[PDB]
């Protein structure tokens, strides 16, 4: 905790707070990116932030697209995740490293938000549940 | 002359009391943080137009003045855009001054009509052996690039740029539709490093115009950036008279962006999830890539296949427009063959004897049959034995093993980090070279003779050097002196030569920091608009 | 016998690959139809309110 901030929008919190928690935590970590230092942001369950944003947009009666999601649910996560950069030397040289966490359902990377974040991010760390009980922990496929 | 009425996400309604702007016209929101361009999508009635923003709409007030430009989005075109990076609306994002515009062209355009089209259907010689022989490029056609990461896709992009500018004297546009900014910056610096983009006073000698619509841009900006690259390419076609290359990086992201702007305008999605206008929103882009009577645009579009499903409607609609595929393989690249074009999974519509002639067609089909014949016995060699089957089967093994080497080729933009000079290979030399290996005129030359060389009068010089290298081996010996005390010290000496770096427990962080004081009270605006505490009664 | 089994399980992987390819194509059809039908359900639910 001498180096970690925690931004916690829990399940009982309102859906706009769960929507805005990754953006607020990215704003807190962009301080370290922008002033020369180095950041590590971890959006644990960006799936649940996506579900909260879908809630707010269906309740605002914006037109739903695939699975119920809005049109700009890709723009949501890409606008969030492109703030993880390594800056140039004339901007301090600082950096911010994102680890979004996406829960899959029975291990398909063909789900809509999972495909969106796979399209956005650089790599992936795919943890397989079959490898989990074979003793292999971390269960990295 | 018009004012903002609704702001719902990236979708802005503007109201005009005078006359309305046309659909696809560009509107400037007067008074904002950044330049906010809207593009008119429909006339809703009651003097309202429905627009789709090219930047963020956060910070937009109902009643904000909006100026109609009287035209669609207009971008700078010409030779002054070469070596520059533009966004969708034409602003320079490479931070190197303005853009020296020859003209300012509308990005919205009808396709070149029937009388202007070319009926010739000829081949674009690219100087790459595996591309010219097995999967040729139509001059004016669309080519799907099934590459990825680590298969040398960017080197192939820069070599198509380099060889087309070198041979046919045409320029290139790269439309980075929805690319990540790390990948776009990597391609920018790799183009500066390889000499196809030059900065400063040598800027006119650049071969490529980058048009970047990044992934953090709104869906309206990613949906239109391919049209901006098209307009830059169409100026070189229609005014300069060139054979242009356009690179639509991830045509699937163009599809996905137009699907997002169709979903945001409240249209019912068609099959699997796509826009109802998917075929026409794709064909509006792809039909402007053609051969006119002036010049041509040849488009190399990277294709992503959504769930490894070729019957998905976005690749099934894209593959109707494609004239060739060049599949880049990891297994080809792990045999050290560069470029990593899969010689058997790459196709071309230009591969039939009515456009390339029976000579080129039969050489390509013989090469492809020989590599296929080697491909379906590798489960017979690895199972039963290498020298197990016939000599004729091992003749096809040796011939396809040296043709599989011969498809590799050193690249001219790769020489600044590989040293090996790149070699442009002409088409007739490629035909006459692979015909000789196919008949068996080079069955005596080694397999490493056919490796990273231009044409058939270089595999001979490769073997000549390899057999002069036999006589250069008895010049010395092999030995490694001083088994335990040449340079390997005591481990205490090795830890007493590494220098201690300075570590402090005051981490700092108060270097150029404001440290404002944040109020705990909630501060609102009164009806006059001044910052006031909350009136403390519900 | 061992060589006959090597030639017999050669045709078994051929059959279990062509059956797999047919089943993968039919799964892709069912995946596309699932996304379309769930989308048509969602659109019909939303259009009956607006």
XYZ file of C-alpha atoms in Angstrom:
729
model
C 0.000 0.000 0.000
C 2.981 2.355 0.015
C 2.699 2.292 -3.798
C -0.874 1.130 -4.514
C -4.084 3.098 -4.902
C -7.324 1.138 -4.760
C -10.406 2.354 -6.606
C -13.311 0.198 -5.494
C -16.793 0.488 -7.004
C -18.428 -2.555 -5.490
C -21.567 -4.476 -6.407
C -23.888 -2.457 -4.177
C -22.680 0.777 -5.764
C -24.686 2.345 -8.552
C -24.081 1.325 -12.146
C -22.622 4.756 -13.123
C -20.016 4.374 -10.395
C -19.013 0.940 -11.684
C -18.889 2.465 -15.146
C -16.706 5.353 -13.978
C -14.319 3.466 -11.690
C -11.866 2.360 -14.439
C -11.852 5.871 -15.848
C -11.236 7.376 -12.419
C -8.480 4.888 -11.644
C -6.893 5.567 -15.008
C -7.027 9.275 -14.195
C -5.235 8.556 -10.917
C -2.572 6.466 -12.683
C -2.076 8.982 -15.481
C -0.575 11.239 -12.824
C 2.333 8.828 -12.590
C 2.426 8.400 -16.364
C 2.425 12.138 -17.062
C 5.054 13.243 -14.510
C 7.883 10.916 -15.511
C 7.153 7.958 -13.238
C 5.696 4.566 -14.140
C 2.235 3.189 -13.617
C 0.481 -0.157 -13.400
C -3.295 -0.045 -13.683
C -5.366 -3.190 -13.199
C -9.015 -3.039 -14.231
C -10.237 -6.135 -12.467
C -13.394 -7.344 -14.209
C -13.728 -4.955 -17.085
C -16.540 -7.415 -17.865
C -18.507 -5.984 -14.949
C -17.798 -2.412 -15.987
C -19.129 -3.369 -19.401
C -22.294 -4.816 -17.836
C -22.786 -1.630 -15.783
C -22.434 0.553 -18.875
C -24.928 -1.661 -20.702
C -27.324 -1.178 -17.795
C -27.090 2.617 -17.950
C -27.473 2.658 -21.716
C -30.490 0.375 -21.863
C -32.111 2.429 -19.149
C -31.395 5.618 -21.109
C -33.079 3.843 -24.074
C -30.124 4.082 -26.368
C -30.495 1.585 -29.235
C -29.106 -1.815 -28.271
C -26.769 -3.847 -30.392
C -25.173 -7.226 -29.898
C -25.987 -9.169 -26.707
C -27.633 -6.056 -25.492
C -24.712 -3.744 -25.679
C -24.569 -0.213 -27.112
C -22.783 0.782 -30.274
C -20.045 2.592 -28.370
C -19.158 -0.240 -26.017
C -16.023 -0.799 -28.109
C -15.300 2.928 -27.951
C -15.753 2.715 -24.168
C -12.972 0.215 -23.642
C -10.672 1.477 -26.385
C -10.957 5.058 -25.110
C -10.147 3.723 -21.643
C -7.317 1.376 -22.569
C -5.460 3.615 -25.026
C -4.431 5.781 -22.069
C -1.954 3.033 -21.157
C 1.037 4.204 -23.161
C 4.778 4.656 -22.860
C 5.476 8.322 -23.378
C 8.310 9.908 -25.297
C 11.480 11.338 -23.787
C 10.277 14.905 -24.363
C 7.215 14.087 -22.224
C 9.154 12.652 -19.296
C 9.407 9.135 -20.666
C 6.769 7.891 -18.266
C 4.495 4.963 -18.805
C 1.282 3.251 -17.764
C 0.701 -0.491 -18.116
C -2.839 -1.835 -18.178
C -3.966 -5.286 -17.127
C -7.656 -5.502 -17.966
C -9.325 -8.619 -16.609
C -12.077 -10.225 -18.696
C -14.090 -13.163 -17.398
C -15.097 -15.654 -20.062
C -18.026 -18.050 -19.907
C -16.832 -21.658 -20.389
C -13.698 -20.374 -22.106
C -14.768 -18.740 -25.357
C -12.881 -15.752 -26.710
C -15.754 -15.246 -29.144
C -17.928 -13.326 -26.693
C -18.572 -9.735 -27.642
C -16.755 -7.799 -24.922
C -13.990 -10.411 -24.862
C -13.476 -9.951 -28.617
C -13.507 -6.179 -28.160
C -10.807 -6.181 -25.490
C -8.781 -8.788 -27.433
C -8.909 -6.387 -30.373
C -7.838 -3.491 -28.149
C -5.021 -4.947 -26.056
C -1.556 -5.918 -27.226
C -1.246 -9.456 -25.889
C -3.377 -11.723 -23.793
C -2.772 -14.037 -20.862
C -5.299 -16.809 -21.311
C -5.810 -18.829 -18.143
C -7.450 -22.182 -18.839
C -9.603 -23.870 -16.225
C -8.584 -27.340 -17.386
C -4.945 -26.504 -16.626
C -5.975 -25.230 -13.185
C -6.758 -28.634 -11.671
C -3.905 -30.391 -13.470
C -1.681 -28.726 -10.871
C -0.488 -26.029 -13.280
C -0.950 -22.831 -11.280
C -0.810 -20.129 -12.781
C -3.009 -21.914 -15.289
C -1.538 -20.172 -18.312
C -2.519 -21.644 -21.665
C -26.183 29.259 -38.507
C -27.243 26.098 -36.730
C -27.360 25.126 -33.095
C -26.910 21.915 -31.124
C -30.203 20.391 -30.033
C -29.409 16.858 -28.813
C -26.195 15.195 -27.630
C -26.565 11.436 -27.160
C -23.098 9.924 -27.019
C -21.211 10.397 -30.279
C -24.484 11.272 -32.014
C -25.392 14.962 -32.166
C -28.613 16.531 -33.423
C -28.178 20.025 -34.847
C -31.079 22.348 -35.638
C -30.974 24.791 -38.566
C -33.536 27.569 -38.828
C -32.386 28.401 -42.353
C -31.769 25.665 -44.886
C -30.327 22.337 -43.891
C -26.887 21.057 -44.839
C -26.745 18.092 -47.145
C -26.292 14.560 -45.917
C -22.548 13.746 -45.520
C -21.795 17.462 -45.153
C -19.274 18.598 -42.581
C -20.240 20.889 -39.715
C -17.910 22.720 -37.347
C -19.051 23.111 -33.754
C -18.145 26.727 -33.027
C -16.607 27.001 -29.593
C -15.157 23.891 -27.985
C -11.905 22.590 -26.562
C -10.751 20.903 -29.768
C -11.962 20.984 -33.361
C -15.249 19.071 -33.267
C -16.370 18.082 -36.758
C -19.767 16.471 -37.231
C -20.892 14.685 -40.376
C -24.570 14.929 -41.304
C -26.113 11.461 -41.362
C -29.802 12.183 -41.967
C -32.446 14.865 -42.001
C -34.773 14.036 -39.144
C -37.438 16.551 -40.058
C -38.530 19.607 -38.077
C -35.367 21.360 -39.326
C -33.083 18.962 -37.462
C -30.127 17.107 -38.898
C -28.662 14.055 -37.225
C -24.889 14.022 -37.144
C -22.089 11.699 -36.093
C -19.098 13.277 -34.406
C -15.471 12.788 -35.352
C -14.214 13.601 -31.853
C -15.520 13.425 -28.306
C -18.854 15.075 -27.568
C -18.157 15.495 -23.860
C -18.426 19.190 -23.128
C -21.154 20.026 -25.633
C -24.089 22.286 -24.765
C -27.517 22.368 -26.391
C -27.567 25.667 -28.218
C -23.896 25.726 -29.181
C -23.356 27.373 -32.538
C -22.560 25.020 -35.415
C -21.194 26.285 -38.731
C -22.001 24.366 -41.891
C -19.021 24.208 -44.236
C -21.222 23.570 -47.264
C -19.377 20.399 -48.232
C -18.334 17.022 -46.841
C -15.130 16.487 -44.872
C -12.363 18.031 -46.948
C -8.775 16.828 -46.645
C -5.447 18.090 -48.040
C -4.266 16.053 -51.009
C -1.194 16.162 -53.164
C 2.497 15.507 -53.001
C 2.694 17.677 -49.902
C 0.952 14.999 -47.861
C 3.719 12.447 -48.466
C 5.558 11.465 -45.329
C 2.937 13.178 -43.176
C 0.365 11.691 -40.832
C -3.214 12.915 -41.045
C -6.241 12.117 -38.947
C -9.684 11.656 -40.514
C -10.470 15.367 -40.885
C -7.114 16.283 -42.416
C -5.217 17.715 -39.488
C -1.525 16.838 -39.172
C -0.972 14.630 -36.149
C 2.720 14.021 -36.832
C 3.554 17.383 -35.149
C 5.627 18.607 -38.079
C 3.898 21.824 -39.037
C 0.939 22.212 -41.367
C 0.286 20.101 -44.465
C 1.341 21.620 -47.786
C -1.928 21.141 -49.636
C -1.971 20.904 -53.405
C -5.764 20.789 -53.196
C -8.455 20.262 -50.571
C -10.670 17.400 -51.734
C -13.997 16.091 -50.506
C -13.661 12.617 -49.037
C -17.106 11.613 -50.285
C -17.248 10.600 -53.893
C -19.048 8.366 -56.314
C -17.179 5.432 -57.801
C -15.574 5.913 -61.232
C -18.412 5.307 -63.639
C -18.685 2.621 -66.286
C -17.125 4.602 -69.132
C -14.059 5.411 -67.023
C -13.319 1.836 -65.952
C -10.568 -0.304 -67.415
C -11.468 -3.561 -69.128
C -7.840 -4.690 -69.398
C -7.340 -6.694 -66.150
C -3.556 -6.653 -66.045
C -0.992 -7.673 -63.444
C 0.833 -5.392 -61.002
C 4.475 -6.425 -60.894
C 5.628 -6.055 -57.306
C 9.226 -7.264 -57.415
C 8.555 -10.028 -54.881
C 9.003 -13.522 -56.280
C 6.348 -15.484 -54.384
C 3.847 -12.661 -54.918
C 4.542 -12.240 -58.627
C 4.499 -15.941 -59.426
C 1.850 -17.731 -57.395
C -0.558 -15.000 -56.276
C -0.203 -12.039 -58.659
C -1.722 -8.655 -57.941
C -4.229 -7.109 -60.300
C -3.455 -3.522 -61.232
C -6.537 -1.967 -59.719
C -7.502 -4.930 -57.575
C -7.987 -5.567 -53.894
C -5.608 -7.912 -52.092
C -6.294 -9.481 -48.715
C -3.328 -9.821 -46.393
C -3.812 -12.584 -43.832
C -0.742 -11.818 -41.775
C -0.501 -10.972 -38.105
C 2.352 -10.523 -35.645
C 5.906 -11.672 -36.231
C 5.349 -12.923 -39.783
C 7.029 -9.874 -41.293
C 3.861 -8.080 -42.331
C 5.256 -4.575 -41.854
C 8.366 -5.416 -43.883
C 6.090 -6.639 -46.680
C 4.028 -3.423 -46.442
C 7.121 -1.247 -46.683
C 8.471 -3.344 -49.531
C 5.299 -3.064 -51.576
C 5.543 0.695 -50.950
C 9.224 0.709 -51.905
C 8.952 -1.481 -54.985
C 5.850 0.204 -56.372
C 7.428 3.644 -55.964
C 10.678 2.350 -57.462
C 9.213 0.474 -60.429
C 5.978 2.187 -61.433
C 6.631 5.580 -59.859
C 3.378 5.576 -57.894
C 2.857 6.743 -54.356
C 1.311 4.966 -51.431
C -1.289 5.769 -48.817
C -1.552 3.807 -45.588
C -4.987 4.047 -44.001
C -4.620 2.872 -40.429
C -8.309 2.233 -39.783
C -8.768 1.733 -36.059
C -5.196 0.701 -35.322
C -3.700 0.818 -31.846
C -1.516 3.849 -31.298
C 1.446 1.726 -30.208
C 1.271 -0.220 -33.486
C 0.744 2.967 -35.476
C 3.746 4.626 -33.864
C 5.786 1.471 -34.463
C 4.889 1.530 -38.152
C 5.675 5.258 -38.328
C 9.132 4.898 -36.800
C 9.800 1.762 -38.837
C 8.943 3.689 -41.987
C 11.270 6.510 -40.937
C 13.991 3.930 -40.222
C 13.557 2.194 -43.589
C 13.643 5.351 -45.665
C 10.142 5.260 -47.135
C 9.246 8.256 -44.943
C 11.690 11.143 -44.626
C 11.467 14.049 -42.187
C 12.493 17.671 -42.582
C 13.846 19.044 -45.855
C 13.968 15.616 -47.530
C 10.200 15.245 -46.939
C 9.353 15.347 -50.646
C 11.250 12.113 -51.253
C 8.837 10.150 -49.087
C 6.761 7.468 -50.751
C 3.924 7.104 -48.266
C 1.107 9.166 -46.790
C -0.094 7.863 -43.454
C -3.747 8.469 -42.642
C -4.350 7.380 -39.058
C -7.702 7.016 -37.376
C -6.838 5.563 -34.031
C -8.690 3.104 -31.842
C -9.535 5.664 -29.162
C -11.294 7.848 -31.716
C -15.111 7.713 -31.846
C -16.808 5.294 -34.267
C -17.561 8.082 -36.730
C -13.874 8.891 -36.981
C -12.832 5.272 -37.472
C -15.596 4.751 -40.022
C -14.449 7.583 -42.294
C -10.660 7.410 -42.129
C -10.509 4.844 -44.931
C -12.298 7.376 -47.141
C -9.636 9.942 -46.253
C -6.906 7.539 -47.327
C -8.964 6.865 -50.449
C -9.133 10.565 -51.244
C -5.377 10.948 -50.873
C -4.963 7.958 -53.198
C -7.544 9.235 -55.680
C -5.690 12.510 -56.073
C -2.578 10.598 -57.123
C -4.682 8.490 -59.462
C -6.785 11.203 -61.077
C -4.449 14.212 -61.102
C -0.950 12.748 -60.913
C -1.864 9.762 -63.099
C -0.099 7.141 -61.008
C -0.456 3.531 -59.959
C -1.233 4.174 -56.321
C -1.070 1.707 -53.454
C -3.629 1.972 -50.697
C -3.233 -0.043 -47.518
C -6.447 -0.351 -45.548
C -5.078 -1.744 -42.301
C -7.771 -4.093 -40.962
C -10.733 -3.721 -43.307
C -12.634 -5.589 -40.576
C -12.186 -2.611 -38.277
C -13.678 -0.433 -41.017
C -16.642 -2.822 -41.063
C -16.872 -2.808 -37.264
C -16.704 0.996 -37.117
C -19.468 1.416 -39.682
C -21.478 -1.174 -37.758
C -21.053 0.924 -34.617
C -22.195 4.110 -36.327
C -25.145 2.231 -37.783
C -26.059 0.920 -34.343
C -25.748 4.387 -32.821
C -28.072 5.925 -35.407
C -30.772 3.526 -34.258
C -30.881 1.210 -37.248
C -31.946 -2.397 -36.872
C -28.912 -4.688 -37.220
C -28.995 -7.301 -39.982
C -27.404 -10.761 -39.826
C -25.093 -11.827 -37.287
C -24.839 -8.406 -35.736
C -23.837 -6.193 -38.547
C -25.212 -3.029 -40.055
C -28.080 -3.501 -42.522
C -26.051 -1.540 -45.083
C -22.950 -3.732 -44.701
C -22.562 -4.653 -48.360
C -23.089 -1.082 -49.533
C -20.981 0.517 -46.787
C -18.193 -1.839 -47.822
C -18.808 -1.449 -51.547
C -18.802 2.320 -51.302
C -15.191 2.113 -50.187
C -14.066 -0.764 -52.394
C -15.565 0.488 -55.655
C -13.517 3.673 -55.579
C -10.438 1.435 -55.643
C -10.293 0.665 -59.350
C -8.388 1.389 -62.527
C -9.517 4.563 -64.251
C -8.208 5.688 -67.639
C -5.755 7.950 -65.788
C -4.154 5.531 -63.341
C -5.118 2.936 -60.793
C -5.414 2.257 -57.086
C -4.297 -1.170 -55.901
C -5.471 -1.917 -52.388
C -3.719 -4.210 -49.926
C -6.216 -4.712 -47.113
C -5.442 -6.700 -44.002
C -8.344 -9.059 -43.319
C -9.313 -10.327 -39.881
C -11.715 -13.279 -39.808
C -13.942 -12.891 -36.711
C -14.380 -16.299 -35.076
C -12.129 -18.195 -37.504
C -15.331 -18.323 -39.538
C -15.095 -17.443 -43.220
C -18.883 -17.521 -43.600
C -19.276 -14.618 -41.189
C -20.860 -11.775 -43.192
C -18.022 -9.311 -42.813
C -15.348 -11.561 -44.417
C -17.935 -13.067 -46.752
C -18.763 -9.561 -47.955
C -15.096 -8.564 -48.120
C -14.068 -11.681 -50.083
C -16.457 -10.753 -52.878
C -14.282 -7.705 -53.511
C -10.883 -9.350 -53.162
C -8.828 -10.215 -56.215
C -5.975 -12.003 -54.426
C -5.071 -13.266 -50.992
C -1.535 -13.446 -49.657
C -1.640 -15.535 -46.498
C 1.398 -14.937 -44.306
C 2.194 -18.022 -42.250
C 4.086 -18.586 -39.024
C 5.212 -22.014 -40.201
C 6.738 -20.463 -43.324
C 8.496 -17.905 -41.123
C 9.860 -20.611 -38.811
C 11.759 -22.118 -41.726
C 13.577 -18.800 -42.044
C 11.830 -18.028 -45.340
C 11.165 -14.329 -45.822
C 8.676 -13.077 -47.015
C 6.497 -15.479 -45.071
C 3.877 -15.872 -47.809
C 2.246 -19.271 -47.636
C 2.813 -20.438 -51.226
C -0.145 -22.829 -51.218
C -2.874 -21.016 -49.272
C -2.389 -17.744 -51.147
C -4.781 -17.379 -54.065
C -5.272 -14.980 -56.935
C -8.002 -14.387 -59.464
C -5.227 -13.278 -61.840
C -3.958 -16.884 -61.909
C -5.522 -18.251 -65.072
C -3.959 -18.389 -68.551
C -6.249 -15.739 -70.069
C -4.621 -12.825 -68.245
C -1.079 -14.049 -67.540
C -0.544 -16.448 -70.411
C -0.005 -20.186 -70.495
C 3.737 -19.829 -69.799
C 3.311 -18.042 -66.458
C 0.187 -20.060 -65.625
C 1.824 -23.440 -66.157
C 4.978 -22.425 -64.301
C 2.878 -21.296 -61.327
C 0.697 -24.400 -61.359
C 3.716 -26.668 -61.649
C 5.424 -24.947 -58.708
C 2.222 -25.130 -56.677
C 1.677 -28.804 -57.575
C 5.267 -29.696 -56.659
C 4.997 -27.977 -53.280
C 1.639 -29.666 -52.718
C 3.138 -33.050 -53.627
C 5.865 -32.494 -51.062
C 3.289 -31.288 -48.540
C 1.164 -34.456 -48.484
C 4.054 -36.876 -47.943
C 5.600 -35.229 -44.881
C 3.462 -37.577 -42.790
C 5.090 -40.349 -44.847
C 8.673 -39.144 -44.395
C 8.356 -38.393 -40.677
C 6.579 -41.698 -39.998
C 8.267 -44.312 -42.203
C 11.629 -42.692 -42.984
C 13.391 -39.941 -44.913
C 15.067 -42.176 -47.500
C 12.229 -44.714 -47.214
C 10.213 -43.977 -50.372
C 11.229 -43.749 -54.033
C 13.902 -41.652 -55.679
C 11.263 -39.817 -57.727
C 9.433 -38.996 -54.503
C 12.739 -37.793 -53.100
C 13.239 -35.946 -56.389
C 10.068 -33.983 -55.668
C 11.303 -33.628 -52.080
C 14.551 -32.064 -53.289
C 12.898 -29.916 -55.984
C 10.233 -28.613 -53.621
C 12.804 -28.205 -50.876
C 14.803 -25.903 -53.134
C 11.726 -24.136 -54.565
C 10.521 -23.565 -50.999
C 13.892 -21.932 -50.404
C 13.789 -20.038 -53.713
C 10.596 -18.189 -52.804
C 12.530 -16.275 -50.151
C 14.055 -12.968 -51.164
C 16.089 -10.215 -49.476
C 14.211 -6.965 -49.062
C 15.501 -3.467 -49.710
C 13.932 -1.894 -46.627
C 15.309 -4.738 -44.510
C 18.933 -4.014 -45.434
C 19.371 -1.276 -42.807
C 19.255 -3.930 -40.090
C 20.060 -7.161 -41.952
C 22.957 -6.034 -44.144
C 21.922 -8.247 -47.065
C 21.033 -5.988 -50.018
C 17.483 -6.242 -51.251
C 16.853 -7.527 -54.744
C 13.962 -6.508 -56.970
C 13.076 -9.436 -59.238
C 11.304 -8.910 -62.532
C 8.414 -11.032 -63.739
C 9.963 -12.682 -66.809
C 13.092 -13.440 -64.801
C 10.880 -15.052 -62.141
C 9.106 -17.187 -64.748
C 12.354 -18.219 -66.445
C 13.912 -18.895 -63.057
C 11.225 -21.124 -61.595
C 10.735 -22.975 -64.876
C 14.365 -24.066 -64.717
C 14.042 -25.396 -61.180
C 10.819 -27.142 -62.172
C 12.299 -28.982 -65.173
C 15.413 -29.851 -63.191
C 18.206 -27.705 -64.626
C 19.305 -26.896 -61.067
C 19.084 -30.322 -59.421
C 22.866 -30.258 -58.922
C 23.025 -26.942 -57.049
C 22.587 -27.149 -53.252
C 19.439 -26.219 -51.373
C 21.135 -23.257 -49.700
C 22.044 -21.928 -53.133
C 18.398 -20.914 -53.535
C 18.253 -18.797 -50.382
C 17.819 -15.017 -50.100
C 18.779 -14.284 -53.700
C 17.194 -12.330 -56.500
C 17.007 -14.488 -59.619
C 18.472 -17.555 -61.259
C 21.885 -16.051 -62.028
C 22.420 -15.615 -58.289
C 21.836 -19.182 -57.099
C 24.790 -20.127 -59.307
C 26.990 -17.468 -57.715
C 25.723 -18.596 -54.300
C 26.884 -22.163 -55.004
C 30.130 -20.816 -56.503
C 30.843 -18.965 -53.271
C 29.845 -22.056 -51.264
C 32.385 -24.171 -53.165
C 35.150 -21.529 -52.937
C 34.319 -21.719 -49.218
C 35.543 -25.327 -49.181
C 39.088 -24.147 -49.935
C 38.893 -21.326 -47.356
C 38.428 -23.732 -44.418
C 42.031 -25.044 -44.204
C 43.245 -21.501 -43.399
C 42.988 -21.993 -39.619
C 41.866 -24.328 -36.833
C 39.251 -24.358 -34.054
C 40.243 -24.033 -30.388
C 39.309 -22.106 -27.234
C 42.243 -21.137 -25.016
C 42.572 -21.206 -21.210
C 39.753 -23.513 -20.067
C 39.432 -21.983 -16.579
C 41.403 -18.699 -16.520
C 40.999 -16.829 -19.809
C 38.575 -14.135 -18.614
C 36.456 -15.984 -16.009
C 37.344 -14.552 -12.602
C 36.487 -15.459 -9.068
C 32.820 -14.795 -8.391
C 33.799 -12.253 -5.735
C 35.725 -10.415 -8.449
C 32.625 -10.498 -10.642
C 30.493 -9.004 -7.879
C 33.221 -6.464 -7.076
C 33.183 -5.091 -10.629
C 29.462 -4.314 -10.839
C 28.792 -0.774 -9.695
C 26.253 0.031 -6.997
C 23.392 2.244 -8.171
C 21.830 4.895 -5.925
C 18.632 3.846 -4.121
C 16.815 6.247 -1.793
C 13.841 5.664 0.502
C 12.449 9.134 -0.131
C 10.547 8.309 -3.319
C 9.784 11.994 -3.844
C 6.776 12.607 -6.162
C 6.461 16.261 -5.101
C 8.404 17.532 -8.086
C 6.305 20.114 -9.974
C 3.081 19.394 -8.083
C 0.250 21.874 -7.568
C -1.365 20.444 -4.386
C -4.736 22.131 -4.644
C -7.146 21.992 -1.728
C -10.328 20.092 -2.550
C -13.531 21.260 -0.920
C -15.631 18.685 0.882
C -18.746 20.791 0.362
C -20.650 20.298 -2.880
C -20.478 23.463 -4.965
C -23.216 24.128 -7.517
C -24.217 26.969 -9.820
C -27.103 29.270 -8.989
C -29.452 30.637 -11.647
C -27.054 33.516 -12.332
C -24.342 30.894 -12.829
C -21.969 31.513 -9.914
C -20.346 28.866 -7.737
C -22.601 28.513 -4.689
C -22.972 25.843 -1.955
C -25.993 23.578 -1.994
C -29.178 25.217 -0.690
C -29.641 23.178 2.444
C -33.322 22.277 2.122
C -34.842 19.698 -0.232
C -1.035 -56.446 -37.887
C 0.854 -53.381 -36.688
C 1.181 -52.032 -40.203
C -2.489 -52.752 -40.902
C -3.412 -50.855 -37.737
C -1.160 -47.989 -38.833
C -3.091 -47.899 -42.100
C -6.412 -48.312 -40.282
C -5.933 -45.443 -37.847
C -4.755 -43.375 -40.806
C -8.266 -43.507 -42.234
C -9.765 -42.983 -38.783
C -8.128 -39.588 -38.362
C -9.186 -38.769 -41.916
C -12.772 -39.625 -41.023
C -12.577 -37.834 -37.668
C -11.208 -34.791 -39.446
C -13.837 -34.637 -42.169
C -16.575 -35.227 -39.592
C -14.954 -32.522 -37.456
C -14.928 -30.109 -40.381
C -18.601 -30.727 -41.120
C -19.403 -30.276 -37.445
C -17.357 -27.068 -37.247
C -19.201 -25.613 -40.250
C -22.560 -26.506 -38.727
C -21.477 -25.018 -35.398
C -20.562 -21.777 -37.175
C -24.055 -21.731 -38.681
C -25.597 -22.251 -35.246
C -23.396 -19.533 -33.721
C -24.431 -17.005 -36.365
C -28.089 -17.976 -36.031
C -27.877 -17.679 -32.238
C -26.519 -14.136 -32.420
C -29.127 -13.149 -35.023
C -32.085 -14.618 -33.129
C -31.066 -13.135 -29.773
C -30.580 -9.791 -31.493
C -34.011 -9.970 -33.144
C -35.523 -10.774 -29.742
C -33.799 -7.753 -28.169
C -34.839 -5.413 -30.992
C -38.442 -6.628 -30.832
C -38.462 -6.084 -27.088
C -37.120 -2.557 -27.415
C -39.389 -1.592 -30.309
C -42.498 -2.592 -28.353
C -41.659 0.133 -25.828
C -40.555 2.984 -28.094
